[PDB]
Design a protein around this nucleic acid. Sequence first.
RNA 1: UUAAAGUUGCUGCAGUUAAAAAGCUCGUAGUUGGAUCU
RNA 2: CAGAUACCGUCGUAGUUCCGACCAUAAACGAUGCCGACCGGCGAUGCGGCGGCGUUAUUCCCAUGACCCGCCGGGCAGCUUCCGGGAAACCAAAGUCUUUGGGUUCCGGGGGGAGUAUGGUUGCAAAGCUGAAACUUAAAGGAAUUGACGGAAGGGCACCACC
Lengths: 132, 82, 71, 24, 101, 129, 218, 216
Amino acid sequence: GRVRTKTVKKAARVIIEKYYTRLGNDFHTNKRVCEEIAIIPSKKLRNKIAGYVTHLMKRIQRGPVRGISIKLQEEERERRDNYVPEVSALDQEIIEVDPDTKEMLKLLDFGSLSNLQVTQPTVGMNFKTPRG
Amino acid sequence: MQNDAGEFVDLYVPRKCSASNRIIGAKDHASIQMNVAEVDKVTGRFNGQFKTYAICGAIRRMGESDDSILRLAKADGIVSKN
Amino acid sequence: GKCRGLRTARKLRSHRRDQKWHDKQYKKAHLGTALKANPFGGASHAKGIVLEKVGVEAKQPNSAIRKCVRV
Amino acid sequence: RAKWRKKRMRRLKRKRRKMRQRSK
Amino acid sequence: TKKRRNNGRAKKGRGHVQPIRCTNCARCVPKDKAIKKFVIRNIVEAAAVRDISEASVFDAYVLPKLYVKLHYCVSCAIHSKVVRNRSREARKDRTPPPRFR
Amino acid sequence: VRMNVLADALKSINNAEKRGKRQVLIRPCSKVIVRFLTVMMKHGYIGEFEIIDDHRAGKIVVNLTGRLNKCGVISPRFDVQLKDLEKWQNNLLPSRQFGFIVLTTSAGIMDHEEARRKHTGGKILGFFF
Amino acid sequence: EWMPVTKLGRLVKDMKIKSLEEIYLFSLPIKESEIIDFFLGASLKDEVLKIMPVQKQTRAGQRTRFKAFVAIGDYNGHVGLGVKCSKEVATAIRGAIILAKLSIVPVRRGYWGNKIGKPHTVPCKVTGRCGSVLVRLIPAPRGTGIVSAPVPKKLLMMAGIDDCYTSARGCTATLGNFAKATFDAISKTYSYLTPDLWKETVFTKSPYQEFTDHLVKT
Amino acid sequence: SGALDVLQMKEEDVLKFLAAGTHLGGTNLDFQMEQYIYKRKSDGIYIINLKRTWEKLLLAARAIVAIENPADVSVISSRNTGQRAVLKFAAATGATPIAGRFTPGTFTNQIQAAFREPRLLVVTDPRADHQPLTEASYVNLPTIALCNTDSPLRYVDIAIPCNNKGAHSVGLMWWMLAREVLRMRGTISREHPWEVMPDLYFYRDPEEIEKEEQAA
RNA sequence: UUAAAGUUGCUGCAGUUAAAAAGCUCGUAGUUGGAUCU
RNA sequence: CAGAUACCGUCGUAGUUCCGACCAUAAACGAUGCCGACCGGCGAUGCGGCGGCGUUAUUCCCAUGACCCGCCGGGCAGCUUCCGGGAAACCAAAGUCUUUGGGUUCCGGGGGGAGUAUGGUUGCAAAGCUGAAACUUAAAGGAAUUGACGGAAGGGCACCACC
Ligand SMILES: [Zn+2]
């Protein structure tokens, strides 16, 4: 069965982590890249490591990978994460509130707020699951 | 503590918890020295002053560290009545 | 638990000696059967006459014959 | 086992109660 | 060393329970201890359903179901593997097995 | 039933102490209990307390400082000679530096020390430290 | 050479913390042995209380290792106690020296009577309690020396407690429990609230909040 | 608040709260939390008393402020509803975040690369992440938290009684904390409404990413 | 024979599983008993 | 079955059942005496009470009942927790114990010998209650820990296992 070693995956992880700019989606490209970048004995080791660099990068383009934190990708997430719609979702001309909420507000002398709409209390009381 | 001559013979003077008055252990690692900042009453900005509190490990596990902190603040006036 | 009252005293004393009879040692000493069965009669030593010479096999884990006398 | 040697003890005791009778 | 807090039986706050006869065994066991398994199934089983369904004089005749209450002495259950032993912590969980998918 | 009110009281305040609480409701109450808590209070081991009066038996509500480690009663009340006091306080008390045996005496209810002054003996109540 | 991996350590190596008591004041965990070693000193010596071999059973046979009990005192200020397991005896020993150097407690000392000179004994009678072993230290009149079994006597000696009346009930044979219990006793001495400490505490700036600026630099 | 008219809560904020629904907790109530509770309405939902909430916010604020170097404040969110919120909060405040998995033994272990010794600890939920708190037990960290009507107060120091369940409530609470600590530091102002919108501190979900990316 | 023995325990032990709480309740002596009166 | 006066099976006495007189023993077990005080929560339940929108017993008024939401006092229990214990298993009592004293009854003193001998006593009888010693012996024992094993329950691999 074909499965990658600790050495394979860890090495490919650290390599991709540091040199990510230099890598590309071609096997041979990153092969000749890894013959330079790091120091590896023999061949099969090298080829395998590079192969997982390739595979790992094919997975990178889809989205975030659990094992590596590349850089600027904290800044790129700072970009993506930063967003806002023209108006806040917190802004509504009418918000509905229960009579008791209006009471707790009336204690805080906010019972004069304009945006409020008092909504009718539900007549049945069942909040609970029927045990059994 | 003090001998007949009035000297203080001791290694150090331990600190008592603010809430429950218990002595805080030399090694009690659940212990808390908390610092609460003092505002300037006119502005709302930072003074450079603070009131400090101490809570031992015991009350932390009971979780009543919270309530103690609170009525401590009330007693110091850093929390409004009600 | 134990009875701690002031006027309780006799209860304590009585019961104490009565549990005291359940100590193997004290029983042996103050009963007097022990003294009676003793071949010595409580003496430290006893003079005797030699009837015969007897070999005695040692207990299990170690092997020897102990040289003994029937007196 | 306990139950059985209790039983055996009662057998033996009955037998001793027979072998020594108040007539002896 | 006490094994179960409840001593294997459901008995609490009462002195003695009515004894019952094992389904499989005939071995006498008190009702509280007795492993009870209720069985609701069909009189005729899987294939003979589609078989007999065709031989009927009635249309849309629903097959009767057999209902049987079962009592097993502790032994018999572990034999039939109706009940199997579990780990010290996992024992504590009296929530019934997930036959509901 | 309930006997030796004092005992239960002291158990209560000590238990509420170990837990680390501020206030106690100890019920019911007696003059004895009251003076007791008073003697404790003057040394500061406890604090100030308020007697709620009821038409049966009073309830005492007590304020606390953490300074009280152990508070206890000795039942039965033992008759204690002036000679004997030493052995007692060497037995009950943590150190010769602090802690008090409370005895009821003909003079009144007080510390072992105060009674060493007044040159009196009496019956023993309890202790604290 | 010693490289500080913690803020406390760096604060120590840079001479920003004058005494050890600044640490005990705030009950900071001490994660390094070179703090304790830097602070004191030649004043430190240590005892090998016991080496007990222990066996684990495997399909192979009995695989054996060693528990070293080490008691390291500074006569008059502090004690420490540590236990280490290892396959090799030496390693277990020095490892346990690190272990006991990590756990060091100051010992509060009282007067038996009228207060004159320097404290010779425990402040009041205290109870260390470990695993069916109950060790009880009581103050003793000046000069009576330490009355006890050898093992807690070692501790109390290095603790700089000159005189104590010791009672010990339990199964006292097992060494670990004995040592750890009497140790518990001399730990609890600064946990006992006497009328002396009834004064309200004036707080101080914590070593982290005071030197935080010098910590940012390194 | 020092009961001062400065820090006293304005109506607008109350509107933000009433919008994000932070005043609505679960059906379960801890006997520690009853202090902050207002009253239970029908349908079993406990209603949170908001003035008390605000005061706790300010207390926690002064608490954060009092630390000199801002990096000594650690801010941790286990679950997803808080990730981004924690990120932005730390970004503005200059504190050290941990988002996602909090690696156990972070605080207590000198050899790890994760090791740090924060002066204060701020946490999204007590129920979800117990780990950091139980560490604070070992290292002497004071602890700030957001409690629902049901949370254990064990090893929490100053608690903030809000709704930590819904995304909006969480985002808003974080943002408000940021606003408060910042207006406290002397930076920004008590006058100008803050530039940064509370909406930035919300939680995405993949559905909204898809909606707004496929709207463009 | 005394201490060690807090292994006769009043100070001071124990009685779920190690030795051990009577099957259960009633009951005379015995022991013990709430506040409260300068 | 080597052997089964045993497990399996067919037959089947005393007994199992009722009434009237004896017997007084069980792993009669929560293996945890009884009265009392204090000490964290949380949902459930049984019984009585108190209060509360809303459903229902058909359409409106009060009773009353069924659900539903709470509060109070007893109960059987449960779950939870660095309350504290504890040799540990575990225990909100087995907690409030060298910081040792709320009241009281019963009761244990290494293991065997032995719950035997004897006397006394109760019974129609089987037995019950009270109950030794001579001698013997370095352990017997309790929790938990790694092993190894099981004719236990699970998985797992191999053409020196099979298909
Ligand atoms: Zn069966």
